[PDB]
Design an enzyme around this catalytic site. Structure first.
Site, short mmCIF file in Angstrom:
data_model
loop_
_atom_site.label_atom_id
_atom_site.label_comp_id
_atom_site.label_asym_id
_atom_site.label_seq_id
_atom_site.Cartn_x
_atom_site.Cartn_y
_atom_site.Cartn_z
N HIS A 243 0.85 -1.17 0.00
CA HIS A 243 0.00 0.00 0.00
C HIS A 243 0.90 1.23 0.00
O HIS A 243 2.12 1.11 -0.02
CB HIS A 243 -0.93 -0.10 1.19
CG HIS A 243 -1.99 -1.08 0.95
ND1 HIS A 243 -3.07 -0.75 0.18
CD2 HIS A 243 -2.17 -2.35 1.38
CE1 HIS A 243 -3.89 -1.80 0.16
NE2 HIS A 243 -3.36 -2.76 0.88
N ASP B 145 -0.19 6.93 -3.38
CA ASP B 145 -1.37 6.59 -4.16
C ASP B 145 -1.73 7.71 -5.12
O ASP B 145 -1.99 7.45 -6.29
CB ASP B 145 -2.66 6.34 -3.37
CG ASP B 145 -2.76 4.99 -2.70
OD1 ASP B 145 -1.75 4.27 -2.75
OD2 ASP B 145 -3.84 4.67 -2.11
C1 LIG Z 1 -6.85 2.38 -1.29
C2 LIG Z 1 -5.98 1.18 -1.22
O1 LIG Z 1 -6.03 0.41 -0.29
S1 LIG Z 1 -4.93 0.99 -2.69
C3 LIG Z 1 -3.96 -0.47 -3.24
C4 LIG Z 1 -2.51 -0.21 -3.52
N1 LIG Z 1 -1.85 -1.20 -4.38
C5 LIG Z 1 -1.97 -1.23 -5.72
O2 LIG Z 1 -3.03 -0.96 -6.28
C6 LIG Z 1 -0.81 -1.73 -6.55
C7 LIG Z 1 -1.25 -2.82 -7.52
N2 LIG Z 1 -0.68 -4.08 -7.10
C8 LIG Z 1 -1.10 -4.81 -6.06
O3 LIG Z 1 -0.39 -4.90 -5.06
C9 LIG Z 1 -2.52 -5.39 -6.05
O4 LIG Z 1 -3.36 -4.64 -6.93
C10 LIG Z 1 -3.20 -5.55 -4.67
C11 LIG Z 1 -2.13 -5.89 -3.62
C12 LIG Z 1 -3.88 -4.24 -4.26
C13 LIG Z 1 -4.26 -6.65 -4.64
O5 LIG Z 1 -3.60 -7.97 -4.58
P1 LIG Z 1 -4.38 -9.30 -5.07
O6 LIG Z 1 -5.64 -9.46 -4.28
O7 LIG Z 1 -3.31 -10.35 -5.13
O8 LIG Z 1 -4.81 -8.92 -6.57
P2 LIG Z 1 -4.01 -8.99 -7.96
O9 LIG Z 1 -3.90 -7.62 -8.55
O10 LIG Z 1 -2.71 -9.73 -7.82
O11 LIG Z 1 -5.04 -9.87 -8.84
C14 LIG Z 1 -6.47 -9.61 -8.94
C15 LIG Z 1 -7.20 -10.89 -9.27
O12 LIG Z 1 -8.56 -10.59 -9.70
C16 LIG Z 1 -8.78 -11.13 -10.98
N3 LIG Z 1 -9.80 -10.30 -11.65
C17 LIG Z 1 -9.71 -8.98 -12.05
N4 LIG Z 1 -10.84 -8.54 -12.56
C18 LIG Z 1 -11.72 -9.61 -12.49
C19 LIG Z 1 -13.07 -9.78 -12.86
N5 LIG Z 1 -13.81 -8.83 -13.42
N6 LIG Z 1 -13.64 -10.99 -12.63
C20 LIG Z 1 -12.89 -11.95 -12.06
N7 LIG Z 1 -11.62 -11.91 -11.67
C21 LIG Z 1 -11.09 -10.70 -11.92
C22 LIG Z 1 -7.39 -11.20 -11.60
O13 LIG Z 1 -7.33 -12.03 -12.75
C23 LIG Z 1 -6.59 -11.73 -10.40
O14 LIG Z 1 -6.73 -13.15 -10.15
P3 LIG Z 1 -5.37 -14.05 -10.05
O15 LIG Z 1 -4.20 -13.18 -9.66
O16 LIG Z 1 -5.64 -15.10 -8.99
O17 LIG Z 1 -5.12 -14.67 -11.43
#
Ligand SMILES: CC(=O)SCCNC(=O)CCNC(=O)[C@H](O)C(C)(C)COP(=O)(O)OP(=O)(O)OC[C@H]1O[C@@H](n2cnc3c(N)ncnc32)[C@H](O)[C@@H]1OP(=O)(O)O
Ligand SMILES: CC(=O)SCCNC(=O)CCNC(=O)[C@H](O)C(C)(C)COP(=O)(O)OP(=O)(O)OC[C@H]1O[C@@H](n2cnc3c(N)ncnc32)[C@H](O)[C@@H]1OP(=O)(O)O
Lengths: 359, 359
Positions: free
Chosen positions: A126, A156
């Site tokens: 985050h 962010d």
């Molecule tokens: C305000 C806050 O708290 S802000 C968050 C700050 N971080 C970021 O955004 C940086 C981006 N990188 C990241 O760290 C991630 O986005 C996180 C940590 C926020 C989330 O981590 P995770 O829960 O592991 O999600 P990640 O981005 O890896 O994957 C999302 C999943 O949803 C799936 N997905 C996305 N859209 C859809 C949909 N419409 N339908 C179904 N599945 C979907 C993806 O295919 C993926 O599945 P998989 O990885 O098992 O193949």
């Protein structure tokens, strides 16, 4: 649709934090923004004001029908925003190379913290994590305490969504020559580092040290800090320039001849003690009066709930009311193609209905 | 000139803080940026790395010749950036209407704190003042202490320069359709408000309070805060999602069954004490090793001087060596038209030269 980005078409793969903030701002400025969320999700109209200026659609992107409809939207659009971990869109079939096959005009905008490659590129994180690694978090807070997160404003938003926006829009300008889109790689660790470029500049010339709470702009300077008033509320003092500082001293009742020099850092303890006792002698609203229309750089530190009563805020319409709370109006402002009030969150639309519309 | 903004011409009327930052980022992405300073302030080559990717020229804008030479630049340019108080460019004869006479295509970008009009519009100010009026500064810092400025990152840069950039680049997109420029009015008090829209959204839904140090993202949550380690150095914890939180607890050696619930806010002080004792029992780098490749959202809090030695920073080339020390490389990043390493600030050139070069 009102605003300078009228006609711009955007597809947002729903995530959290910087991606939706950037999508919001494009919408705010008149872009046509279609947000694809998962069906497992959306149990009504959203209560999240950040999802203003949107059409929401539902689609299991894991299914082949889901992916196909998605690739049909992207085909008809100028911008894609995704903020998943690297690899995620690839594995869905929605990666850049796949997108480039159905629309080589696409601006493919990738919003992450750590970036697309390297050792941390698959670690969850985050805001606080990204700004911890590049020196920013360590610089924030009092010298006698552990660092304090500046909410999630710096990684962010300031160093995240805003750099994504600049990338998208810079890439659209490029697309004017080339007729080709491209990939924008916006990492919070990089954008936040350019956000704090001034400190890196000053560090190089000996005008900023790594010691927390001992610099001109971190709270270390008595003339750039908050002060507690008689009522327990606060003012902010930003009187850097000597002429503003002199104006502040006169309004406080302190004779310059009785104080240490403004920039004699060895005597900052004495100076702070003097300014502290002076501001503590009257209440915040007293100081707000004394210094209104002055160049003393003294302002009341208002809580969110009081902001709606401040005349300068009211008069410029910085905020508008919406469903049990004030929200900020779009920024920045445009003389000819003005933004309009944001359209609140709307119930979900059908992805076919949208493809029709986009013709 | 490398980057997506190759061919964009920008005249910058020299000032401080957000205007130079915006102009720097435009330069970084390959814009042709010409900065007009006054003869009286320029001496050697500037040692302010924020003045990278510029050509510097001088001119008394109060003279007849300075005004003329300046208007001839602006005639040839796409964008003008000024960050003086409102009325200042008008009185020099460089106001929007005068510029619209010699170039109806100009994006005229005005960077202020308070905006173009309203009761505070002529008041001197700095970052700390702009963020004090709109609720932001009140929300930053520990609950038992006065608010602490988050350097000048939130008003000047995040809610300042970055919104001026979004407005400049959005206006250029509008221009492709309309054939015309317009005025961009970027006020730090507005931009910083949009920058913190997530708090206003959360406030409306009962998920953010005006009490400082009592929220999920302000340091009040034990799973979103810094912790002091055995060596007096810090880690950041950002483990919001329960699965990342669980992973952190395992790595700390703490049985979840022994602890209060993650989100029982009444017991946060109690949870914080347990986590404090755990983090305190080893040094920072220990935790850095333990949680590398983890989703626990635990990272070392590096000081500026340590950033050059972090693998993730090195391998993505987030920085480059300059002149006095390390500087952030341009952000964000572009697959096809990539930015180059910034050109260091080079000596004053002659305004006629630039006019030849441009026409
Ligand atoms: C305000 C806050 O708290 S802000 C968050 C700050 N971080 C970021 O955004 C940086 C981006 N990188 C990241 O760290 C991630 O986005 C996180 C940590 C926020 C989330 O981590 P995770 O829960 O592991 O999600 P990640 O981005 O890896 O994957 C999302 C999943 O949803 C799936 N997905 C996305 N859209 C859809 C949909 N419409 N339908 C179904 N599945 C979907 C993806 O295919 C993926 O599945 P998989 O990885 O098992 O193949
Ligand atoms: C790092 C930091 O602390 S940055 C953030 C500071 N805040 C802002 O930028 C908000 C907008 N700007 C301002 O509020 C103001 O410029 C301040 C408060 C920063 C400084 O106030 P002032 O010193 O009164 O400057 P102001 O903008 O009013 O006018 C600048 C003067 O420079 C003059 N000037 C500008 N360029 C030239 C030139 N090339 N040659 C000669 N004179 C010049 C202008 O003519 C103007 O003169 P005038 O008002 O005497 O007719």
């Amino acid at each position: 649709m009102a605003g300078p980005l009228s006609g711009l078409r955007v597809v947002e793969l729903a995530g959290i934090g910087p991606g939706p903030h950037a999508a919001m701002i494009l919408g705010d400025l008149g872009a046509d923004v279609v947000r694809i969320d998962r069906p497992s999700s959306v149990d009504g109209i959203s209560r999240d004001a950040m999802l203003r200026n949107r059409r929401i659609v539902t689609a299991d992107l894991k299914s082949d029908q889901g992916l196909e409809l998605a690739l049909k939207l992207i085909a008809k659009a100028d911008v894609l925003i995704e903020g998943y971990r690297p690899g995620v869109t690839e594995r869905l079939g929605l990666g850049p190379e796949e997108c480039a096959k159905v629309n080589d005009r696409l601006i493919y905008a990738r919003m992450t913290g750590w970036g697309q490659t390297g050792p941390r590129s698959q670690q969850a994180g985050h805001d606080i994590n990204y700004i911890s690694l590049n020196g920013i978090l360590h610089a924030i807070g009092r010298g006698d305490e552990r660092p304090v997160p500046p909410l999630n404003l710096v990684g962010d938003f300031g160093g995240g969504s805003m750099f994504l926006l600049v990338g998208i829009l810079a890439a659209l300008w490029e697309r004017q020559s080339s007729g080709k889109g491209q990939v924008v790689d916006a990492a919070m660790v990089d954008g936040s580092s350019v956000l704090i470029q001034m400190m890196w500049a000053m560090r190089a010339t000996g005008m900023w040290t790594d010691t927390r709470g001992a610099n001109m702009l971190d709270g270390g300077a008595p003339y750039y800090d908050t002060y507690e008033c008689a009522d327990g509320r606060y003012v902010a003092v930003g009187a850097i320039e000597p002429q503003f500082y002199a104006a502040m001293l006169a309004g406080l009742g302190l004779d310059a001849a009785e104080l240490p020099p403004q920039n004699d850092r060895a005597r900052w303890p004495e100076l702070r003690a003097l300014l502290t006792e002076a501001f503590a002698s009257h209440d915040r609203d007293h100081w707000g009066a004394v210094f209104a229309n002055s160049d003393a750089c003294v302002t009341p530190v208002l809580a969110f709930g009081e902001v709606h009563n401040e005349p300068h805020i009211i008069e410029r319409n910085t905020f508008y009311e919406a469903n049990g709370g004030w929200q900020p109006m779009p920024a920045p402002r445009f003389s000819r193609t003005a933004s309009s009030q944001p359209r609140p969150p709307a119930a979900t639309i059908d992805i076919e209905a949208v493809l029709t519309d986009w013709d």
